[PDB]
Amino acid sequence: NALISRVFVQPKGDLADRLNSRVTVVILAVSSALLLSSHFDPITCWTPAQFNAQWVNFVNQYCFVHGTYFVPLDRTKVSIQYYQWVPYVFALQAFLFYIPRFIWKAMIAYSGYDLAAAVKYVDRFWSENRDKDDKFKTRLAAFEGRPSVYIWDGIRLARKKRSRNMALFYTLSTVWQAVNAWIQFYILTQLLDSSIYTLWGPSILGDLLQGNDWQTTGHFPRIVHCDFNRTVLCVLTLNIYYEKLFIFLWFWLVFVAVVSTVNCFKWIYYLCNKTKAQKTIKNYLSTAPIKSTISDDQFFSALGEDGLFIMDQMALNLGDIPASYLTISMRNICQDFI
Amino acid sequence: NALISRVFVQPKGDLADRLNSRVTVVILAVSSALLLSSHFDPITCWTPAQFNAQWVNFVNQYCFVHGTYFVPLDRTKVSIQYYQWVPYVFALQAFLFYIPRFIWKAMIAYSGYDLAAAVKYVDRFWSENRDKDDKFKTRLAAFEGRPSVYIWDGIRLARKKRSRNMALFYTLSTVWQAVNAWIQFYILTQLLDSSIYTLWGPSILGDLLQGNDWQTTGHFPRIVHCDFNRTVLCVLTLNIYYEKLFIFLWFWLVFVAVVSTVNCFKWIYYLCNKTKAQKTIKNYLSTAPIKSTISDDQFFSALGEDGLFIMDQMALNLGDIPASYLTISMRNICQDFI
Amino acid sequence: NALISRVFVQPKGDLADRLNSRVTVVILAVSSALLLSSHFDPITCWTPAQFNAQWVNFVNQYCFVHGTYFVPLDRTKVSIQYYQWVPYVFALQAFLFYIPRFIWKAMIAYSGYDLAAAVKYVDRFWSENRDKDDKFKTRLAAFEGRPSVYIWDGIRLARKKRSRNMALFYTLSTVWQAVNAWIQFYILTQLLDSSIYTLWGPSILGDLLQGNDWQTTGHFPRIVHCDFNRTVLCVLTLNIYYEKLFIFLWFWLVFVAVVSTVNCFKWIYYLCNKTKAQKTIKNYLSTAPIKSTISDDQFFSALGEDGLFIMDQMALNLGDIPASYLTISMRNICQDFI
Amino acid sequence: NALISRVFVQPKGDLADRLNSRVTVVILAVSSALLLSSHFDPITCWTPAQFNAQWVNFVNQYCFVHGTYFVPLDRTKVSIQYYQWVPYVFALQAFLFYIPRFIWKAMIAYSGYDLAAAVKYVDRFWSENRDKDDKFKTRLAAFEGRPSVYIWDGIRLARKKRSRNMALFYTLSTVWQAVNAWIQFYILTQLLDSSIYTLWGPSILGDLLQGNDWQTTGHFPRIVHCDFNRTVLCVLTLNIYYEKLFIFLWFWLVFVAVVSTVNCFKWIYYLCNKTKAQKTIKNYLSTAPIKSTISDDQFFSALGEDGLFIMDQMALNLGDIPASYLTISMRNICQDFI
Amino acid sequence: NALISRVFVQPKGDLADRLNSRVTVVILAVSSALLLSSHFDPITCWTPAQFNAQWVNFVNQYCFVHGTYFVPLDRTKVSIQYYQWVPYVFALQAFLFYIPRFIWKAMIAYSGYDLAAAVKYVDRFWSENRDKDDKFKTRLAAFEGRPSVYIWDGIRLARKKRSRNMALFYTLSTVWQAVNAWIQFYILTQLLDSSIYTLWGPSILGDLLQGNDWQTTGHFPRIVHCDFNRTVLCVLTLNIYYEKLFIFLWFWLVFVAVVSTVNCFKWIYYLCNKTKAQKTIKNYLSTAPIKSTISDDQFFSALGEDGLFIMDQMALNLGDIPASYLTISMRNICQDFI
Amino acid sequence: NALISRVFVQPKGDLADRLNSRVTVVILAVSSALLLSSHFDPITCWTPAQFNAQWVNFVNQYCFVHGTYFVPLDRTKVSIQYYQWVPYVFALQAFLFYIPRFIWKAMIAYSGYDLAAAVKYVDRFWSENRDKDDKFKTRLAAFEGRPSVYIWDGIRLARKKRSRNMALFYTLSTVWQAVNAWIQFYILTQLLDSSIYTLWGPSILGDLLQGNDWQTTGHFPRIVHCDFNRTVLCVLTLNIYYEKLFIFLWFWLVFVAVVSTVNCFKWIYYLCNKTKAQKTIKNYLSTAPIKSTISDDQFFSALGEDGLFIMDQMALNLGDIPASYLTISMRNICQDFI
């Protein structure tokens, strides 16, 4: 519960359902650690001649490492062996699922504007004096003094260092996310042999919901024979788990794809439109009863390079009410800039 | 006790008996984790020829994975095999029971008004200065200053973002809840074979309360034979649990349905009536001895879009006394809005 | 989790992806501790004559310590023995990966200016009064009083003790880092025999993705024979792990090289250019609206010996916003020095 | 992790790489505790007649305690027995490595001036009011009042008790350190027999990097015979560790010697020169812009007996910046002494 | 680690290397608890007739409790039996080593002046206001007010109760310490038989460093025969420890003697001289620049009965600087006494 | 370590070496719990016919519960059986050793003056404001106000309730203590048979220090025969402990007697003399330089009934300095009483 906490609870990225990669890592790591641990008896074999308890402890290993085969109980083309495949390809899947978070962190470090620190700053500020009755009716000026100047200084200091298209870097991160999810699903498809039957939810379920476990479908057995060179049959207790999770995992994996690529398009149409991207800010700026000097045009031209993305991240992490105040205050203070 | 706490105690949704899904998840997960753990000897078989202690450790597995059959002790149509069925279909039931909470959270995030944060805010406010003697006779103005403005700013900021029918989203969540419960019950009905006898509380109990365990009812055995191809009988110690909980679980499961669909209708009649939906608010507004300027008509027209649902959620979570104050104060401050 | 915390979380060096050595140490130590612990049955052998359970517990050891051999199942040149090699050469790799951090710490102690203490000082200062509203509009003078004088006194006190080329010592540390990484990769290449086949990612993968496990590629077996002098075959359960991580580790190891040598060049071009090295400082000094007396020429001539490197370390560890203030203040106070 | 903490983390001696003795103690104690614990099967023997499981549990002990021998597989002069030697001589090495710290502590107690208390005092003082903004511009007078008078009173009180050559006692401690390291290395050289081959890194490695494990080099075997009086062979699983650490330890041990004797010379040239020993103090005294009354000659004649060594210890433990202040203040206050 | 802490860390007697008794207790208790615990197989015997696993579990006990004998492998005079001797005589040694601390505590309680309380009082006082800047320039008067009056009241109150020769009681305690150490060493000498060979470091080492383990020296065997009445040989795995610590312990034990008897003489010459006993006090009283009224003669005549010993204990426990202040203040206040 | 703490550390009775009963309870309880736990194999027997591993597990019990006998190896009068005796008579000894503390507590509760509460009160008072510099020069009046009035009110309130001879009750408790110790020693003497040899330190040691273990002294054997009715010998591994502690315990037990009866006489001579009982008080009252009005005669006549014993208890628990103040203050305030 400590490593899962290290990967899930302790780091704070509250992205829009992009904690699905962070939870997929946990799911696949749990699977890969619970499979090869052998439920601490994967396979047990029987040769009806004699058993000095030292034949069995060896022939088990032999039929495990050396491939087995299967025949319908009534031709040996079905040579089932995917035990050197799965319990490690799953860990590899977990690692390739975690990669894009590292890519995005490194990319934001290259962009030159530490976003996580700014989010945490506005967060502990909004949680520090949300309860001060005295500093609540001066709420606008309150947000004007302390944090707004900080965010603005960060903007000034980043604008001169490779930070005018941070949204471009982010949308590249998310398109990488989507392509990664599709590649993981495709690899899962060809996991068994890519020449013997390939698995996927609907077909295997529909077959399984007609009473076709293995005695009539052949594929996916649980009683397999292994030869011996100088035939012995045995029960393969592990297959009773694999399919009973492949049918699950497959479905779930598809879900991730469907929830990532869509999240890609929302983050590309944005980069294409640039006239409805400013809709949330233009909405926030219609709540202050001051309307003093600045028009939203010059405000955006002084802000619209990167400030839009940072304001979106603020509105996504902190909520909305503690973001409208921030943006209206940043409009108030943006006097001596443009 | 840590994961059950993660799922039950730590997140705070105090909905009206909709913690029944949150407790059903725990019940079914405990069942599915205690079954396949094998009470850490599911089945033990006996072939009265010889026992080198290496026949038994294998024939157990063989008769477990390969289906068995049963005959009344006096024809082989009863081929009992539901061990690849239950201990995983239960975990799947648990997951589909947990889904609707995720649906509702995502839906409220799409609606554009973080309700949980608002509830927690009014909660820690009402628990902060419930004990301040000085700020208790100024109770009305107290609720007027700090939290009422917050809730109202949230309303203003959400009204311009896809939030005018939050009650519609919520009633869709609850109708999904009801349909989900009925589907889980139906799946439980067809769990054994859907062609061999199907189970349900009253019949199996009435049969069990006449002395019809298996020696005369046939179905649900505990001493079954398994063949062997190149017959051996054995005791099936697991069946002594399954029915002894199916009779229970079934009943309990029905309960959930009966307590969810009714909770659906209460949350649909509401959406249909819109003249008794305002009854709690109209009742609260008959306790302040001020009756200053606003009539309940204009107050509702400025509020009745979403404010009704949020006030109901407040009255449901925080109690009632710390909600009448909130609503009377929100009426007091609603001067410069409509 | 305590020793990994001692090596990773507790000491605070936040260098630019030079925590890759600090994480490689953990990876290789985990590998070397999980291999020789024998997954607490590396090899199990079978001599089809008799087994009093005291032949096996000895012949295992004999075939383990004494080298085995392998033949394709259809000449004995393949004498596989790398069990006295790997699980200790990995620990040695971990130690040689950790060395450069020790080299750099000793080198900075010889240079005569404790950098870690200065970083921690500016850190706890910037985290002490980042929240003081009163001492935030006096931010420039705030950084002028307390920490700037400290950093400047350190500069004065080090300038007279073998500290004018601290950047030279650091770039020597990083070139040692790069050469070390390349040497570790090269040693990994020749790990098996350097006369029998040598391993490397692309070839072994491409062979493994055509169905060439060992039955047709010969090398990397899992069923090997061992002789006996006064032949017995056996299964080598350990090989099913080694390759399944060598293919991984190899790749990862290459990554380190590619991410270290590049980090070397960035830290050499710097030492060669000395006109774009001053780019970050010249950028920071274009944000204060004072422009009082000092030109960047004399400022650098009073600072450019070591101050550049220390300012870079500050900007790298603390972020950027709490570094522009530091450097602009150090320019403000640098009146009575040159 | 508690005893290692007692010996390493809890006592605070931060000497210049003389924590190498403190870490060598840990290394050798870990080795000596992990060897004789038998990796909780050092040796297992085989007599191909019969095995009632009570011959083996005894003949193991017999061939372990009674010496074995070895012959190249093709004369009995190689009688390998170093199991009564190593796992205890290592603990003895650890103890003799720890001795010099005890010698130095007792010697400083005999000198009559508790140095550790003075260091801890200036440390908690410099860490108490390093953050007081008010008591930072009065920094010189601050160090003048509280701690400087303490150090000076200690000097006065020790000068009349066998403390005028504390540096002599310290350099004797360090020359003992060096001689001890060389003696430990020499003992390690003659550890096997001093008549049979003696081990040392380069030769044994160069032989091991040509494929000369034992089948052709004879020495260092792993399959040895033991006789029996009223021959049985056996595998010696322990040798697969010994060399695989002797090659390591040897190297590391040499390192200590090379890093101690050099540290001796730096601490003897000092005692010989007495004109560059005062270089750090003469450097510190060129940073205060006061230059009031005292010349460095009379200051040293009032201080140069022991104060030099104590100032060096301060500069070594606390850093440098909190030592220049101390020494300049001690010069300021040294008015009414000489 | 709790009982060792109870005996070592928790009680605070910081005597001059008289913590050697306190650490010897721990050493010998660890030895006596690790020996008779049998390394949780002391002796294992072999009778080459038959082994039903119930002969061995009994003949072991028989040859253990009943004495064995030894013959050089080529007369039975060497009847080795010291297993009923050592692992309990060691615990007895530990107890007799701890006794003198109890003697000294009881003796100081009979003397009528609780010294430990006075030491702890001056300790927590000197550690309370060592950091008060305000109460540091008034240091002399500070020590004059609070603690000096306490120590003086204790002196007054003890002088009338059997306390004028507390130093005599203490030197009796230390001479008992020395005699006890010599008696423990002598008992260790005669531990084996006092008629068969007696052990002592130099001879047994010099013999062991010539290759004389037992095959040629006879004494100290590890393969011994035991008879049986109505001969069976066996390996004595315990002897491989005993000598390998006797050689150590012996040496260490001698050390204690050499460090205790010398500590006796320093504490007797004192009691004999009474003119250099006052040297530390006469030295302390040459550091105050007041020299007001009292000469050291009358001061001693008012103090020199017991105050000398208490001042020595203070200077030994608390250090020296917080003792010179105490004694100079006690001279200042000693006006209205003599 | 929790029950030993409950009996030793947590309750605070610091009587003059009457913590010897409190530590004897622990010693004897540890012995009685470590004996009958069988060092978790007390006796193991051998019948040289056959051993199906089910004869031994029963004949052990038979020869254990049924008495054995012993013959010198060369008449059966020595029928050794004290295993139903010791490991429970020791626990009974522990209980009878603890009784007198209960007797004394009940007796002080019957006397009508809670002494423990008064001691704890003066203790936390003297430890509360021992460090208040301000309330230290007013020390006499300080003790006059708060605690002295409390002790005096307790005296007043007890004098009218069966409390004029509390010293008589206490000396009865201590004479019971002494008689109890002598009875425990006597019972230990007759522990074996009272007709067969009785044990006591000097004789058994002197015999054991001449080489008379059992082969020539007969008594105290370790190899005993047991008959069988429808002879088998066996080793009695438990005797190797019993004597090896009886020789110890005996000695220690004598010590308690010698240290208790003497403590009885000191507490009887007191009750007989009543003119040197007042010596400590008359000594304390010669330290205040006031000598105002009261003579020690009338003071004692107003106090000497019970106050003497309570003052002694104070001086014994709290030390002496915080008792002279108490008694001089109680003399000061004793104006309006007699």
Inter-chain touch B61–A44, beta carbons under 8 Å = yes
Our CA-based measurement puts residue C251 at a distance from the nearest CA of chain D, in whole angstroms, of: 26
Question: Neighbouring chains of B at 3+ CB pairs within 8 Å?
Answer: A
Rounded CA separation D112/E323 (Å): 13
SS (H, E, C) chain D: CHHHHHHCCCCCCCCCCCHHHHHHHHHHHHHHHHHCCCCCCCEEEECCCCCCCCCHHHHHHHHHHCCCECCCCCCCCCCCCCCCCHHHHHHHHHHHHHHHHHHHHHHHHHHCCCHHHHHHHHHHHHHHCCCCCHHHCCHHHHHHHHHHHHHHHHHHHHHCCCCCCHHHHHHHHHHHHHHHHHHHHHHHHCCCCCCCCCCCHHHHHHHHCCCCCCCCCCCCCCEEEECCCCCEEEEECCHHHHHHHHHHHHHHHHHHHHHHHHHHHHHHHHHHHCCCCCHHHHHHCCCCCCCCCCCHHHHHHHHCCCHHHHHHHHHHHCCCHHHHHHHHHHHHHCCCCC
Choose among E222, E244, E287: nearest Cβ to D88: E244
CA distance F318 to F118: 11
3-class DSSP assignment, residue E235: strand
Q: Which residues of E touch D129 (CB under 8 A)?
A: none
Q: HSE (CB half, 13 Å, CA atoms) of F328?
A: 22
Q: Is residue C216 located within the same domain as residue C120? A: no
CA distance C25 to F291: 80
Distance CA C177, CA C169 (A): 12
- What tokens were used for B234? 């054995």
- Amino acid making up residue B272: C
Q: How far apart are the first and last CA of chain C?
A: 52
Residue A251 sits at the chain B interface (C-beta within 8 Å) = no
Q: Distances from the Cα of C214 to the Cαs of C43, C219, C222, C223, C234, in angstroms?
A: 17, 6, 8, 9, 15
Look up residue F3 and give its amino acid.
L
With b for 16 or more beta-carbon neighbours within 10 A and e for fewer, the C86-123 pattern comes to bbbbbbbbbebbbebbeebeebbeebbbbbebbbebbb
* Residue C235 sits at the chain A interface (C-beta within 8 Å): yes
Please judge whether B65 and A319 are an interchain contact, meaning their C-beta atoms are less than 8 angstroms apart: no
CB contact under 8 A, C114 and D51: no
> What is the Cα–Cα distance from A286 to A281, expressed in whole angstroms?
9
**Number of separate helices (H) and strands (E) present in chain B:** 13, 3
Angle, in degrees to the nearest 10, between helices E139-159 and E321-333: 70
Q: How far is CA B315 from CA B16, B119, B150, B298, in A?
A: 11, 10, 17, 22
Contact state of C286 with A160 under an 8 Å Cβ cutoff:
yes
Judge whether F126 and F322 are in contact, CB under 8 Å.
yes
CB pairs below 8 Å between C and D: how many?
A: 67
Q: Is E324's CB within 8 Å of D92's CB? A: no
Sheet holding C43-46, edge to edge: C43-46, C232-236, C223-226
| E125 in reach of chain F (CB within 8 A) | yes
Same domain, F90 and F206: yes
The angle subtended at Cα E14 by Cα E8 and Cα E16, nearest 5°, is 120
Which residue's structure tokens are 């080329």? C165
What letter does residue A237 receive in the DSSP assignment? T
- Shared domain check, D330 and D311: yes
Under a CB-based contact definition with an 8 Å cutoff, are residues F177 and F116 in contact?
A: no
CB contact under 8 Å between C161 and D137, yes or no, is no
Residue pointed to by tokens 């200051």: D299
φ/ψ (deg, to 5) at A334: -80, 70
E231 touches chain D (CB under 8 A): no
Are F189 and F177 found together in one domain? yes
C194 burial level (CB within 10 Å; 0-12, 13-18, 19+)? exposed
Q: What does the angle CA F242 – CA F246 – CA F251 come to, to the nearest 5 degrees?
A: 165
F14 contacts chain E (CB < 8 A):
no
Burial class (CB in 10 A: 0-12, 13-18, 19+), F292: exposed
> Nearest 10 degrees: CA dihedral of C52, C55, C58, C61?
-120
What sign does the CA torsion over C37, C40, C41, C42 have? Answer: negative
| Closest F-chain CA to E124 | F131
In a shared domain, residues F181 and F249: yes
Q: How far apart are the first and last CA of chain A?
A: 52
Kindly report the backbone phi and psi dihedral angles of residue A107, in degrees, each rounded to the nearest multiple of 5, phi listed first: -70, -40
What residues of chain F, 68 to 87, have a C-beta less than 8 Å from chain E?
73
**Residue D147: which of D167, D129, D159 has the closest Cα?**
D129
C-alpha–C-alpha distance, residues E98 and F10, integer Å: 24
List all residues 6 or more positions away from D268 whose beta carbon is below 8 Å from its beta carbon.
Answer: D171, D175
DSSP designation for C134: G
- Claim to verify: residue E244 and residue E148 sit in the same structural domain: no
Chain D CB contacts of C84 under 8 Å are 213, 240, 244
Angle at B217 between CA B211 and CA B221, to 5 degrees: 100
DSSP secondary structure code for residue A244 in this structure: H
DSSP assigned state of A191: S
Asked if E63 and E43 count as a contact pair (C-beta separation under 8 A), the reply is yes
Give the CA distances from residue B305 to residues B110, B156, B330, C106, E95, in Å, rounded to whole numbers and listed in that order: 17, 12, 15, 69, 86
How, if at all, do strands A223-226 and B43-46 pair?
unpaired
SS3 F3: helix
Tell whether F102 and F201 lie within a shared domain: yes
Phi, psi of B238 (to 5 degrees): -85, -35
- D and C interact (at least 3 Cβ pairs within 8 A): yes
F1 has a chain E CB within 8 A of its CB: yes
Distance (Å) from the C-alpha of residue D197 to the closest C-alpha of chain C? 22
Token readout for B96 is 């589909």
Beta strand A43-46 pairing with E43-46: unpaired
Task: Name residues whose C-beta falls within 8 Å of residue E90's C-beta, 6 or more positions apart in sequence.
Answer: E28, E31, E32, E35
Report yes or no: D293 and D154 within 8 Å, Cβ to Cβ: no
The β-bridge partners of E69 are E225
* Residue C328 near residue C298 (C-beta atoms within 8 A): no
Q: Hey, are the CB atoms on A235 and B61 less than 8 Å from each other?
A: yes
**Rg of chain D's alpha carbons, rounded to an integer?**
29
Of the candidates D48, D53, D244, the beta carbon closest to that of C88 is on D244
Asked if D321's CB is within 8 angstroms of C154's CB, the reply is yes
Q: Does the beta carbon of E44 lie under 8 angstroms from any beta carbon of chain D?
A: yes
Beta carbons of E287 and D156 less than 8 Å apart: yes
Chain B touches chain C, with at least 3 Cβ pairs below 8 Å, answer: no
Q: Please give the tally of structural domains in chain F.
A: 3
Helices B239-273, B201-208: crossing angle, 10 deg rounding:
150
Q: How far is A153 from chain C (nearest CA, A)?
A: 7
Cα of C275 to nearest chain D Cα, Å: 31
Distance between CA atoms of residues F3 and A163, nearest Å: 68
Q: Is A329 exposed, middle or buried (0-12, 13-18, 19+ CB in 10 A)?
A: buried
**Distance to chain C for D229, nearest Cα, Å:** 21
Domain boundary among C205, C236, C267: C236
Q: Encode burial over F49-79: b for 16+ CB neighbours within 10 A, e otherwise.
A: eebeeeebeebbeebbeeebbbbeeeeeebe
User: Does residue F232 sit in helix, strand or coil?
Assistant: strand
Chain C residues whose beta carbon lies within 8 Å of the beta carbon of residue A125: 131
The set of residues, in sequence order, having a beta carbon less than 8 Å from that of D202 and lying 6+ positions away, is none
CA proximity to F42, closest of F73, F76, F65? F65
Contacts of A146 in chain C (CB under 8 A): 131, 133, 136
Please indicate, yes or no, whether residues C204 and C166 belong to a single structural domain of this protein. yes
Q: F44–E66: do the CB atoms touch at under 8 Å?
A: no
Type of residue found at E319: G
- Domain extent at residue B48: 41-80+223-236
* Pairwise CB contact (< 8 Å): B153 & A324: yes
Q: What is the DSSP letter of E196?
A: S
Which residue, chain included where needed, has tokens 């020696």? B215
Supply the angle between the helices C139-159 and C115-128 in degrees, to the nearest 10: 170
Chain A residue with CA closest to B84: the answer is A240
CB-CB neighbors (< 8 A) of C2 in chain D: 1
Contact E307, E338 (CB under 8 A): no
| Residue A177 near residue A18, CB atoms below 8 Å | yes
Find which of E320, E324, E325, E328 to mutate to test the D interface (most D CBs within 10 Å of its CB). Answer: E320
What the block records as the tokens of B94 is 């648990």
D234/chain C closest Cα distance in angstroms: 8
The residue written with tokens 């609720």 in the block is: B143
Query: Which positions ≥6 away from A16 have C-beta within 8 Å?
Result: A263, A316
Measuring CA to CA, which residue among C294, C244, C338 is closest to residue C35?
A: C244
Q: Which of B105, B245, B95 is nearest to B184 (CA)?
A: B95
* Long-range contact pairs involving F77-86 (C-beta distance under 8 Å, separation at least 24): F78/F196, F78/F218, F78/F219, F78/F221, F80/F221, F80/F224, F82/F191, F82/F192, F82/F193, F82/F242, F83/F42, F83/F238, F85/F191, F85/F192, F86/F35, F86/F191, F86/F242
Instruction: Kindly determine whether residue E223 and residue D92, on different chains, have CB atoms separated by under 8 Å.
Output: no
Establish, for the pair of chains D and E, how many residue pairs have beta carbons separated by less than 8 Å: 66
Distance of alpha carbon C48 from the chain centroid: 50
Q: Which of D53, D133, D223 sits opposite C65 (nearest CB)?
A: D223
Q: Do D253 and D210 fall within a single domain?
A: yes
Please name every residue paired with B43 in a beta bridge, in sequence order, or none if there are none. Answer: B236
List the chains bordering chain F where 3 or more Cβ pairs fall under 8 Å.
E
- The answer on F94 and F201 residing in a single domain is yes
φ and ψ at A226, to 5 degrees? -130, 140
Strand arrangement, sheet containing E232-236:
E43-46, E232-236, E223-226
**Tokens coding D316:** 């070594």
Stated as kind and residue range, the H or E segment containing B232 is strand B232-236
D324 close contact with C: CB closer than 8 A? yes
How distant is the Cα of D167 from the closest Cα of chain C, in angstroms?
A: 22
Residues F189 and F29 sit within 8 Å (Cβ to Cβ): no
- Is there a contact between A24 and A256 (Cβ–Cβ < 8 Å)? yes
Using alpha carbons only, what angle is made at residue A131 by residues A129 and A133, rounded to the nearest 5 degrees? Answer: 100
Q: Give whole-number Cα distances, E52 to A315, C52, E233, E309, F51, in Å.
A: 80, 16, 18, 71, 7
- The answer to whether residues B4 and B69 touch, using CB atoms and an 8 Å cutoff, is no
Question: How would you classify the pairing of strands C223-226 and B232-236?
Answer: unpaired
d(CA E302, CA E146): 20
| Phi, psi values for residue A234, rounded to 5° | -165, 160
CA E95, E99, E101, E102: dihedral to nearest 10 degrees? 120
The whole-angstrom separation of Cα C329 and Cα C140 is 6
Please list every residue in chain D whose beta carbon sits closer than 8 Å to the beta carbon of residue C112.
320
Please tell me whether residues B149 and B291 are part of one structural domain.
Answer: yes
Which of F181, B276, C230, F109 lies closest to D231 in space, CA to CA?
C230
Q: In E, which residues are within 8 Å of F17 by CB distance?
A: 106
Task: Please state, in angstroms and rounded to a whole number, the distance separating the CA atoms of residues B69 and B81.
Answer: 8
Residue C282, CA distances (Å) to C285, C300, C304, C327 in order? 5, 10, 12, 10
Q: For an interface test with E, which of D66, D107, D162 has the most E Cβ atoms less than 10 Å from its Cβ?
A: D66
D139-158 burial string, b = 16+ CB within 10 Å, else e?
A: beebbbebbbbbbbbbbebb
Inter-helix orientation angle D239-273/D19-35, to 10°:
160
Q: How many CA atoms lie within 13 A of E226 on its CB side?
A: 22
List of chain E residues whose C-beta atoms are within 8 Å of the C-beta of residue F46? 54-55, 58-59, 62
Chain B residues in contact with A48 (beta carbon < 8 A) = 230
Nearest chain E residue (CA) to D63: E235
DSSP E232: E
State whether E190 and E242 are in the same domain.
yes
CA torsion, points D107, D111, D117, D121, in degrees to nearest 10?
A: -140
Whether the CB-CB separation of B71 and B225 falls below 8 Å is answered with yes
Axis-axis angle for helices E307-317, E321-333 (nearest 10): 150
Q: How far is B19 from E44, CA to CA, in rounded Å?
A: 66
Q: Do chains C and A touch (3 or more CB pairs under 8 A)?
A: yes
3-state secondary structure of A236: strand
For B69, the 3-state DSSP assignment is: strand
State how beta strands B232-236 and B223-226 pair.
antiparallel
Conformation bin of residue F22: beta by default, left when phi > 0, alpha when psi is -120 to 50: alpha
Both structure tokens of C10: 């507790």
Contact C45/C61 with Cβ under 8 angstroms?
no
Q: Is-contact D177 D97, C-beta < 8 A?
A: no
> Which chain C residues are Cβ-neighbours of D1 within 8 angstroms?
2
SS3 assignment, position F337:
coil
- Residues of chain E in contact with residue F31, where contact means CB-CB under 8 angstroms, are none
Residue type, D105: K
**In contact, F5 and F23? CB cutoff 8 Å:** no
